[PDB]
Design a protein around this nucleic acid. Structure first.
Ligand SMILES: OC[C@H]1O[C@@](CO)(O[C@H]2O[C@H](CO)[C@@H](O)[C@H](O)[C@H]2O)[C@@H](O)[C@@H]1O
Ligand SMILES: OC[C@H]1O[C@@](CO)(O[C@H]2O[C@H](CO)[C@@H](O)[C@H](O)[C@H]2O)[C@@H](O)[C@@H]1O
Ligand SMILES: [Mg+2]
Length: 580
DNA sequence: GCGATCACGTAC
DNA sequence: CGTACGTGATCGCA
């Protein structure tokens, strides 16, 4: 049953046809400056395996790789493109990426290897990577015979599956989504990851020292107030101290013991001085372990840069995710944690950080899709949407909106986008279910178009079996027909939320593509560093700021044309923190 | 030693 | 109430 192929000792002409399935294997999960363990090529002339030392040193092979007219079909081309960038080799001509294709066809499948994608089309003549390389401590590259056949079988699957995947994408009217959006974005993300973000490690280290001091102080204060010492980090010793020794009330229970969520502690604060200290302790600890020590662990000691990896084929809504490190969840809400951003700086002298963010893109997308007259008019007037919502649901003039009213109207706006729920809104605003229901009821009275949309999108999900975004991304919702209330309700919220979060993802992704095209046309040195769902972070020479102030927001605002305007705010400074 | 499950907290 | 990722803890296991 073995698959035939040539284990070549040198590169030949027929290995360089203008159409081929290409495998450039990088086994390390984090592919930055990682080894390429083997190469496989399958084309009209046959199947070939090349040793990387040989192939990557061959002028003709390297030229073929960089020739845009020589088309390649691959799986996770970004992984290969980045691994090659670290070796000074350009990868061009990737016309089909099976990972991205499978992702667009059904993100729920969680396709993360060629075998998983192949199974979608009843093709099983290829092993899962885990089966070949093992996992964890036992992970390892097998001997050449085993490795070579696996890479050839993967290239063979890609070669065979391209047509069936493209045909289904076309039927789904997602072919342009793959070819004009996700694949071009893949190359942009590769450049971003490869460029990396410079880190002021000395500043982080100083913060770490100061935190260590405060942590020690607070820690001592906690033992003092508790009358003894214990591991504050343990959800058992703390449970005993709080709810047993100190007799604090048990307002919420996890599943295995006492719950100590920040929300639970906030309520217990009035009863004992130890509570506030525990909260403070955790927040400092969160900064220290995750944003100081954790960040320092992944900074490259030679360049002092962190090279995140944007997973482009993971989220069920079309958003990207970020890992090692996650640069999409850096503190900003609280000043103490916000200071962490002072550590992210430009990669060159006299360059600055430029950050642009969409203003309420999700609610603007909702206004567009629901065609709600009131919500559209609000954005056409560019009103403070939370104040406007408060005015409508509480029936008062702008001058009469109090801070608490705006705060609650804001929580309603979030609930509406997430997939409204009286129970969910109740928990969030610490109020009763009927009280939350009253708010929701008032909201729909003020925005009947939104109510219509929520009712209709749910019915549509049931009829078609899936919901779609502006650019045709889709999410299947089988649980929408479940006879279990909780399971069905979750699917209904997904039906309501996915077209919104997903369409916002579509828009910023297109904005990134348009932006890069503009930066190149203008020959600006400015380049993208990060994307955080509704914001783009760039770095550029100080001399380019004025041009960026006009170019970036315009490109982002014009990415798509909706029934309401899109608005983009921007700021720039010496550090990410200052780009406020 | 190791890997998986928790409970938690940070982002948009 | 939507979407993610990384942490320290606790705990069963080749
Ligand atoms: O290269 C990213 C790409 O690979 C997948 C598997 O096909 O994820 C791998 O790489 C990620 C980045 O290092 C890891 O977080 C993940 O654990 C590893 O399996 C895809 O999910 C992704 O699109
Ligand atoms: O009361 C109707 C109202 O309930 C929702 C859930 O919020 O859907 C329920 O009723 C529908 C029939 O009209 C079913 O298709 C659906 O499965 C059930 O949960 C709303 O969508 C609807 O407007
Ligand atoms: Mg914003």
């Amino acid at each position: 049953a073995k698959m035939a192929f040539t284990l070549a000792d040198r590169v030949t002409e027929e290995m360089l046809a203008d159409k081929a399935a290409l495998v450039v294997e990088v086994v390390e999960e984090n592919y930055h400056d990682a080894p390429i363990v083997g190469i496989a090529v399958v084309n009209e002339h046959g199947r070939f395996f090349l040793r990387p030392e040989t192939a990557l040193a061959d002028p003709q092979f390297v030229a073929w790789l960089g020739d845009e007219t020589k088309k390649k079909s691959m799986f996770d081309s970004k992984r290969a493109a980045v691994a090659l960038k670290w070796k000074g080799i350009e990868l061009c001509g990737v016309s089909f990426d099976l990972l991205l294709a499978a992702y667009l066809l059904d993100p729920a499948q969680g396709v993360d290897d060629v075998a998983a994608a192949a199974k979608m089309k009843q093709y099983e003549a290829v092993r899962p990577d885990e089966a070949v390389y093992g996992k964890g401590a036992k992970r390892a590259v097998p001997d050449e015979p085993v490795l070579a056949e696996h890479l050839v079988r993967k290239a063979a699957a890609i070669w065979e599956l391209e047509r069936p995947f493209l045909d289904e994408l076309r039927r789904n009217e997602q072919d342009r989504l793959l070819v004009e959006l996700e694949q071009p974005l893949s190359s942009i993300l590769a450049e971003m990851e490869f460029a990396g973000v410079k880190v002021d490690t000395k500043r982080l280290e100083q913060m770490g020292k100061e935190l260590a001091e405060q942590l020690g102080t607070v820690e001592q204060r906690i033992y003092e107030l508790a009358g003894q010492e214990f591991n504050i980090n343990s959800p058992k010793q703390l449970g005993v101290i709080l709810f047993e020794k100190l007799q604090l009330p048990v307002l919420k229970k996890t599943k295995t013991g006492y719950s100590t969520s920040a929300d639970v502690l906030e309520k217990l604060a009035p009863y004992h001085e130890i509570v506030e200290n525990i909260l403070h302790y955790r927040q400092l600890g969160k900064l220290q372990s995750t944003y100081i020590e954790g960040l320092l662990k992944v900074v490259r000691p030679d360049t002092k840069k962190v090279h995140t990896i944007f997973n482009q084929a993971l989220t069920q809504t079309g958003r990207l995710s970020s890992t090692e490190p996650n640069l999409q969840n850096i503190p900003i809400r609280l000043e103490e944690g916000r200071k962490i951003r002072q550590a992210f700086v430009p990669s060159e002298s006299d360059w600055l950080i430029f950050a642009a963010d969409y203003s309420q893109i999700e609610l603007r997308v909702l206004a567009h899709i629901a065609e709600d007259d009131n919500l559209m008019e609000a954005f056409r007037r560019d009103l403070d949407i939370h104040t406007k919502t408060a005015m409508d649901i509480f029936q008062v003039s702008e001058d009469e909106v109090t801070p608490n009213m705006r705060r609650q109207a804001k929580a309603v706006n979030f609930g509406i986008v997430y997939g409204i729920s009286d129970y969910g809104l109740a928990q969030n605003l610490n109020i009763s279910r009927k009280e939350a229901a009253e708010f929701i009821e008032r909201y729909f009275e003020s925005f009947p178009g939104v109510k219509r949309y929520m009712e209709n999108i749910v019915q549509e999900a049931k009829q078609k079996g899936y919901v779609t975004t502006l650019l045709h991304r889709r999410r299947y919702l089988p649980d929408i027909t479940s006879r279990n209330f909780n399971v069905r309700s979750f699917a209904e919220r997904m039906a309501m939320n996915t077209p919104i979060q997903g369409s916002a993802a579509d828009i910023i992704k297109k904005a990134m593509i348009d932006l890069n095209a503009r930066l190149k046309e203008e020959r600006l040195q400015a380049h993208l560093l990060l994307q955080v769902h509704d914001e783009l972070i760039l770095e550029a020479p100080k001399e380019e700021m004025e041009r960026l102030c006009r170019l970036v927001p315009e490109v982002m605002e014009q990415a798509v044309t909706l029934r309401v305007p899109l608005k983009v705010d921007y700021h720039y400074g010496s550090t990410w923190y200052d780009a406020k």
